[PDB]
């Protein structure tokens, strides 16, 4: 089970870019196609997904590929929303970052007995820019490379 | 006023949670668990209660042994 | 030295009586000078791997701790969504 | 013929005779035999049926035994012929004996005692007085591959022949297919190749009547014969093994599950056998003794079954064992043998007499029929209720305590369909409160409390919350022994949590209260064995019918119910009853853990934190 009414939206979006009824849409029309159904990809992600869909260099994909890509993007988008909610749970002070104090407080909330050195090690390990904490982008990255979700 | 006529069922709260699970998972199909009334009572439609009784009986059959 | 198939003998330099019996005291390994330089560079490189072998093993643990940590909150979060007032 | 009610109409084939009260036996043509314990002739019929029939059910009044070809061969090995057995059955059968049953006995008895296997000079010879059957056996290609041949590929020539040692087990399965079971007869007194051992029985050793009876059944015509003997835990099984070893007085090898069992056996032999300690050696990975001069050896299956490279000394020990000819070998917990690695040990070791002792034989993998040829037919199995009446064993008081599941737990119990569902019902807060109340009750009663929990996490959680010692996976041996000795003597410690390791990995100090929380999933033999091992006869409460107390905490409406019912199948077959108790008086008065709801909610959080990975 994936979607029942959102699949109609994807079909209609495919038909909007397939008014001539050729069965496929241009890959260059995928950028607007994501915008029509609510997706707002970045240019680097657009290039990355064009590389995956168009490994053969055809430039056109059938409805199956478009539907699969749209479902994957929807899943990633709701996953990012849930990760943002989890960060806000971490971000009790609304600072946008999970500092060492925030991590310690939220860990003591669960009653966990993780050592403070381990806490700062976790902060540094998931820290990428070296600011001393973990950012929203870095938290998204650590969730993507997490064990599962 | 809008007052409904159905069937009242009284059982253990574990069975209440079982019925909640059935409604949420829609194992019965359509959402026939219209409204809960008490921690030990529920109010359903008599149309599908018979089949619901079958599913309840199947569960306790699973938690048993055949000789 | 075993990896490089070079003769390697522990240098017995003393003897300790601890534990109620005299026990050998070893001071490194005596290896032929000709292979010595060849033996040294690998060993450091060997260590250069092993320490990294340690580091990854730590990180592989620490990553799991994140999975151990956040998920523990998630259910604690999820429970708050299912019994919260 | 089958009636419409499902009962098989046996009236036509069972002509009743007017000797009703005098004759206590019913002989159904299905092979099942029924005996009335209230009959004045119960004892004689009981003794007769023990040798000839395999027990099935031994409740208070009506006992059911079964007839198998293995039972008939065991009876023949005892020395009973067809005519006397048939006459005794007729004098005891209420109705006429079916001819098909008679024909089945006729077919089995004639083929018994035909093929004999003898081990001499590390060579196995198959011999018979009838070369016609011997020549017929030469036809089987499996036998042809099994029969020892020359290094040139040519088969070798009262006529016998050597047999390949590594092909013995497959031949044994073929013998049943050939309907000619092997005869495991040992020259108890006629042996000259293996010298005797200066080992005797100390006067402190006393043989109980059933023990002596089982030994006499084993030693048919004064000759030791391989077989399987079932003794309840705490019935001096080790004493029986030491007695048999002293009787044979030849080279004796014993196999145990763990080094703790090895030490128990060594202490038993020091306690009863007169053999010098210098001739006693343990082939253990930690305590090593030279195989030279080791008149009696005690080892473990893993040491002999260590397929991977072993220590160089272990190589020498194995070589000495292979060179050594074993007149006698002793195997413990025979139900473990059907495993392939432990079965290979039998091929590895060249032994004449192999006797297996255990408390149970109901393998959930039903790998017992082939076990009849790995060792032999079941020689004896005592009546547990009879030993209860005789006072040899404590009369166990068994209870099944139903703990309703918390609805939040129950909703999650329904939610999970995977193996993670085990933690849901094994961590019931209501079950926790019931356990706490029972522990308080028995501590106020000043009883030894043993809490059995298969799940490691559940056991540790319960022990930590209740502040009691816990035993789990690693269980460093020094700490384990320290805790055990504290439990035996220190009055402050009377509640011990033991994980699955408590079954056979070590001896359990005698207790009176055994509470089982976690189940393997239906191990009707393992948990019954552990229960029998836990509870033993206690002085002071001998007069009372309930001197031992066992309670099983079962989560209601869970899959644990089916597991408990399947598990207690064997114990019910043993005549043990289980009373169901739902309401525990006194819990409301006492204050116990998780009194408030959020405490149980917090426990649910903790358990759910342990996801499917844990
Ligand atoms: Ca924060
Ligand atoms: Ca950052």
PDB file of C-alpha atoms in Angstrom, chain D residues 378-534:
ATOM      1  CA  UNK D 378      14.534 -48.153  26.552  1.00  0.00           C
ATOM      2  CA  UNK D 379      15.375 -50.561  29.359  1.00  0.00           C
ATOM      3  CA  UNK D 380      13.377 -49.025  32.202  1.00  0.00           C
ATOM      4  CA  UNK D 381      11.370 -45.970  33.242  1.00  0.00           C
ATOM      5  CA  UNK D 382      10.140 -45.632  36.818  1.00  0.00           C
ATOM      6  CA  UNK D 383       6.656 -44.477  37.787  1.00  0.00           C
ATOM      7  CA  UNK D 384       6.968 -40.941  39.138  1.00  0.00           C
ATOM      8  CA  UNK D 385       3.763 -41.101  41.177  1.00  0.00           C
ATOM      9  CA  UNK D 386       4.902 -44.425  42.641  1.00  0.00           C
ATOM     10  CA  UNK D 387       8.178 -42.881  43.805  1.00  0.00           C
ATOM     11  CA  UNK D 388       6.140 -40.000  45.213  1.00  0.00           C
ATOM     12  CA  UNK D 389       4.106 -42.472  47.266  1.00  0.00           C
ATOM     13  CA  UNK D 390       7.258 -44.349  48.283  1.00  0.00           C
ATOM     14  CA  UNK D 391       8.717 -41.044  49.478  1.00  0.00           C
ATOM     15  CA  UNK D 392      11.810 -41.308  47.284  1.00  0.00           C
ATOM     16  CA  UNK D 393      10.950 -38.005  45.571  1.00  0.00           C
ATOM     17  CA  UNK D 394       9.215 -34.859  46.738  1.00  0.00           C
ATOM     18  CA  UNK D 395       5.533 -34.701  45.812  1.00  0.00           C
ATOM     19  CA  UNK D 396       5.394 -31.648  43.569  1.00  0.00           C
ATOM     20  CA  UNK D 397       2.542 -29.161  44.016  1.00  0.00           C
ATOM     21  CA  UNK D 398       1.991 -27.687  40.557  1.00  0.00           C
ATOM     22  CA  UNK D 399       0.091 -24.525  39.668  1.00  0.00           C
ATOM     23  CA  UNK D 400      -0.699 -22.553  36.510  1.00  0.00           C
ATOM     24  CA  UNK D 401      -1.210 -18.899  37.444  1.00  0.00           C
ATOM     25  CA  UNK D 402      -3.068 -16.810  34.871  1.00  0.00           C
ATOM     26  CA  UNK D 403      -1.997 -13.164  34.719  1.00  0.00           C
ATOM     27  CA  UNK D 404      -4.256 -10.963  32.553  1.00  0.00           C
ATOM     28  CA  UNK D 405      -2.399  -8.820  30.043  1.00  0.00           C
ATOM     29  CA  UNK D 406      -2.482  -5.065  30.388  1.00  0.00           C
ATOM     30  CA  UNK D 407      -4.734  -3.734  27.592  1.00  0.00           C
ATOM     31  CA  UNK D 408      -2.032  -1.341  26.398  1.00  0.00           C
ATOM     32  CA  UNK D 409       0.341  -4.300  26.363  1.00  0.00           C
ATOM     33  CA  UNK D 410      -2.435  -6.409  24.858  1.00  0.00           C
ATOM     34  CA  UNK D 411      -3.089  -3.866  22.109  1.00  0.00           C
ATOM     35  CA  UNK D 412       0.618  -3.864  21.305  1.00  0.00           C
ATOM     36  CA  UNK D 413       0.572  -7.655  21.649  1.00  0.00           C
ATOM     37  CA  UNK D 414      -1.962  -7.786  18.823  1.00  0.00           C
ATOM     38  CA  UNK D 415      -0.005  -5.092  16.979  1.00  0.00           C
ATOM     39  CA  UNK D 416       3.180  -7.168  16.711  1.00  0.00           C
ATOM     40  CA  UNK D 417       3.064 -10.394  14.698  1.00  0.00           C
ATOM     41  CA  UNK D 418       6.799 -11.143  14.706  1.00  0.00           C
ATOM     42  CA  UNK D 419       9.215 -12.758  17.161  1.00  0.00           C
ATOM     43  CA  UNK D 420       9.349  -9.401  18.972  1.00  0.00           C
ATOM     44  CA  UNK D 421       5.903 -10.310  20.334  1.00  0.00           C
ATOM     45  CA  UNK D 422       7.646 -12.520  22.912  1.00  0.00           C
ATOM     46  CA  UNK D 423       8.848  -9.523  24.919  1.00  0.00           C
ATOM     47  CA  UNK D 424       5.298  -8.163  25.038  1.00  0.00           C
ATOM     48  CA  UNK D 425       3.789 -11.052  26.984  1.00  0.00           C
ATOM     49  CA  UNK D 426       6.983 -12.021  28.813  1.00  0.00           C
ATOM     50  CA  UNK D 427       7.102  -8.578  30.472  1.00  0.00           C
ATOM     51  CA  UNK D 428       3.547  -8.311  31.772  1.00  0.00           C
ATOM     52  CA  UNK D 429       3.397  -5.799  34.660  1.00  0.00           C
ATOM     53  CA  UNK D 430       0.534  -7.755  36.211  1.00  0.00           C
ATOM     54  CA  UNK D 431       2.724 -10.844  35.944  1.00  0.00           C
ATOM     55  CA  UNK D 432       5.499  -8.837  37.611  1.00  0.00           C
ATOM     56  CA  UNK D 433       3.226  -7.924  40.522  1.00  0.00           C
ATOM     57  CA  UNK D 434       2.071 -11.529  40.880  1.00  0.00           C
ATOM     58  CA  UNK D 435       5.689 -12.700  40.923  1.00  0.00           C
ATOM     59  CA  UNK D 436       6.575 -10.098  43.552  1.00  0.00           C
ATOM     60  CA  UNK D 437       3.658 -11.187  45.735  1.00  0.00           C
ATOM     61  CA  UNK D 438       4.626 -14.851  45.410  1.00  0.00           C
ATOM     62  CA  UNK D 439       8.242 -14.053  46.266  1.00  0.00           C
ATOM     63  CA  UNK D 440       7.156 -12.152  49.373  1.00  0.00           C
ATOM     64  CA  UNK D 441       4.838 -14.994  50.362  1.00  0.00           C
ATOM     65  CA  UNK D 442       7.497 -17.683  50.041  1.00  0.00           C
ATOM     66  CA  UNK D 443      10.204 -15.576  51.702  1.00  0.00           C
ATOM     67  CA  UNK D 444       7.847 -15.064  54.638  1.00  0.00           C
ATOM     68  CA  UNK D 445       7.382 -18.832  54.351  1.00  0.00           C
ATOM     69  CA  UNK D 446      11.205 -19.146  54.275  1.00  0.00           C
ATOM     70  CA  UNK D 447      11.529 -21.194  51.092  1.00  0.00           C
ATOM     71  CA  UNK D 448      14.172 -21.417  48.384  1.00  0.00           C
ATOM     72  CA  UNK D 449      12.957 -19.472  45.341  1.00  0.00           C
ATOM     73  CA  UNK D 450      14.237 -20.271  41.845  1.00  0.00           C
ATOM     74  CA  UNK D 451      13.002 -17.997  39.056  1.00  0.00           C
ATOM     75  CA  UNK D 452      13.392 -19.538  35.604  1.00  0.00           C
ATOM     76  CA  UNK D 453      13.339 -17.113  32.676  1.00  0.00           C
ATOM     77  CA  UNK D 454      14.518 -18.070  29.197  1.00  0.00           C
ATOM     78  CA  UNK D 455      14.732 -14.474  27.962  1.00  0.00           C
ATOM     79  CA  UNK D 456      17.978 -12.851  29.076  1.00  0.00           C
ATOM     80  CA  UNK D 457      16.655  -9.282  29.045  1.00  0.00           C
ATOM     81  CA  UNK D 458      13.479 -10.194  30.920  1.00  0.00           C
ATOM     82  CA  UNK D 459      15.439 -12.105  33.559  1.00  0.00           C
ATOM     83  CA  UNK D 460      17.902  -9.259  34.086  1.00  0.00           C
ATOM     84  CA  UNK D 461      15.096  -6.693  34.275  1.00  0.00           C
ATOM     85  CA  UNK D 462      13.159  -8.735  36.836  1.00  0.00           C
ATOM     86  CA  UNK D 463      16.239  -9.438  38.953  1.00  0.00           C
ATOM     87  CA  UNK D 464      17.421  -5.817  38.930  1.00  0.00           C
ATOM     88  CA  UNK D 465      13.970  -4.476  39.797  1.00  0.00           C
ATOM     89  CA  UNK D 466      13.608  -7.034  42.594  1.00  0.00           C
ATOM     90  CA  UNK D 467      17.290  -6.665  43.616  1.00  0.00           C
ATOM     91  CA  UNK D 468      18.113 -10.362  43.351  1.00  0.00           C
ATOM     92  CA  UNK D 469      20.998 -12.353  41.854  1.00  0.00           C
ATOM     93  CA  UNK D 470      20.699 -13.145  38.155  1.00  0.00           C
ATOM     94  CA  UNK D 471      22.309 -15.776  35.931  1.00  0.00           C
ATOM     95  CA  UNK D 472      22.541 -15.288  32.176  1.00  0.00           C
ATOM     96  CA  UNK D 473      24.678 -15.995  29.113  1.00  0.00           C
ATOM     97  CA  UNK D 474      28.339 -15.583  30.133  1.00  0.00           C
ATOM     98  CA  UNK D 475      27.894 -16.093  33.895  1.00  0.00           C
ATOM     99  CA  UNK D 476      31.583 -16.157  34.899  1.00  0.00           C
ATOM    100  CA  UNK D 477      32.085 -19.472  36.652  1.00  0.00           C
ATOM    101  CA  UNK D 478      33.581 -18.071  39.852  1.00  0.00           C
ATOM    102  CA  UNK D 479      30.721 -15.617  40.318  1.00  0.00           C
ATOM    103  CA  UNK D 480      28.237 -18.374  39.470  1.00  0.00           C
ATOM    104  CA  UNK D 481      29.668 -20.714  42.105  1.00  0.00           C
ATOM    105  CA  UNK D 482      29.840 -17.873  44.635  1.00  0.00           C
ATOM    106  CA  UNK D 483      26.164 -17.039  44.129  1.00  0.00           C
ATOM    107  CA  UNK D 484      25.200 -20.718  44.312  1.00  0.00           C
ATOM    108  CA  UNK D 485      27.074 -21.231  47.584  1.00  0.00           C
ATOM    109  CA  UNK D 486      25.529 -18.074  49.021  1.00  0.00           C
ATOM    110  CA  UNK D 487      22.103 -19.410  48.049  1.00  0.00           C
ATOM    111  CA  UNK D 488      22.760 -22.795  49.657  1.00  0.00           C
ATOM    112  CA  UNK D 489      23.901 -21.444  53.029  1.00  0.00           C
ATOM    113  CA  UNK D 490      23.325 -17.701  53.433  1.00  0.00           C
ATOM    114  CA  UNK D 491      19.778 -17.141  54.763  1.00  0.00           C
ATOM    115  CA  UNK D 492      19.789 -13.613  53.336  1.00  0.00           C
ATOM    116  CA  UNK D 493      19.871 -15.054  49.796  1.00  0.00           C
ATOM    117  CA  UNK D 494      16.922 -17.300  48.939  1.00  0.00           C
ATOM    118  CA  UNK D 495      15.829 -15.986  45.510  1.00  0.00           C
ATOM    119  CA  UNK D 496      17.947 -16.829  42.459  1.00  0.00           C
ATOM    120  CA  UNK D 497      17.177 -15.908  38.853  1.00  0.00           C
ATOM    121  CA  UNK D 498      18.491 -18.518  36.416  1.00  0.00           C
ATOM    122  CA  UNK D 499      18.341 -18.286  32.626  1.00  0.00           C
ATOM    123  CA  UNK D 500      18.236 -21.205  30.183  1.00  0.00           C
ATOM    124  CA  UNK D 501      21.693 -22.286  31.408  1.00  0.00           C
ATOM    125  CA  UNK D 502      20.079 -23.840  34.483  1.00  0.00           C
ATOM    126  CA  UNK D 503      18.792 -26.893  32.614  1.00  0.00           C
ATOM    127  CA  UNK D 504      21.967 -28.955  32.206  1.00  0.00           C
ATOM    128  CA  UNK D 505      24.986 -26.609  32.225  1.00  0.00           C
ATOM    129  CA  UNK D 506      25.330 -26.894  36.019  1.00  0.00           C
ATOM    130  CA  UNK D 507      23.779 -28.577  39.049  1.00  0.00           C
ATOM    131  CA  UNK D 508      20.886 -26.777  40.699  1.00  0.00           C
ATOM    132  CA  UNK D 509      20.972 -26.553  44.512  1.00  0.00           C
ATOM    133  CA  UNK D 510      17.884 -28.151  46.003  1.00  0.00           C
ATOM    134  CA  UNK D 511      14.918 -25.794  46.335  1.00  0.00           C
ATOM    135  CA  UNK D 512      11.199 -25.992  47.047  1.00  0.00           C
ATOM    136  CA  UNK D 513       9.690 -23.066  45.115  1.00  0.00           C
ATOM    137  CA  UNK D 514      10.202 -22.958  41.347  1.00  0.00           C
ATOM    138  CA  UNK D 515       8.545 -20.122  39.423  1.00  0.00           C
ATOM    139  CA  UNK D 516       8.658 -20.268  35.625  1.00  0.00           C
ATOM    140  CA  UNK D 517       8.043 -16.999  33.790  1.00  0.00           C
ATOM    141  CA  UNK D 518       9.533 -17.433  30.311  1.00  0.00           C
ATOM    142  CA  UNK D 519       9.138 -20.400  27.973  1.00  0.00           C
ATOM    143  CA  UNK D 520      11.289 -21.711  25.152  1.00  0.00           C
ATOM    144  CA  UNK D 521       8.138 -21.934  23.036  1.00  0.00           C
ATOM    145  CA  UNK D 522       6.889 -25.423  23.807  1.00  0.00           C
ATOM    146  CA  UNK D 523       9.975 -27.340  24.953  1.00  0.00           C
ATOM    147  CA  UNK D 524       7.864 -29.893  26.788  1.00  0.00           C
ATOM    148  CA  UNK D 525      10.973 -31.967  27.519  1.00  0.00           C
ATOM    149  CA  UNK D 526      13.451 -29.225  28.436  1.00  0.00           C
ATOM    150  CA  UNK D 527      11.281 -27.401  30.961  1.00  0.00           C
ATOM    151  CA  UNK D 528      10.000 -30.650  32.471  1.00  0.00           C
ATOM    152  CA  UNK D 529      13.593 -31.842  32.867  1.00  0.00           C
ATOM    153  CA  UNK D 530      14.578 -28.558  34.497  1.00  0.00           C
ATOM    154  CA  UNK D 531      11.584 -28.744  36.845  1.00  0.00           C
ATOM    155  CA  UNK D 532      12.474 -32.279  37.898  1.00  0.00           C
ATOM    156  CA  UNK D 533      16.090 -31.236  38.420  1.00  0.00           C
ATOM    157  CA  UNK D 534      15.099 -28.222  40.534  1.00  0.00           C
TER     158      UNK D 534
END
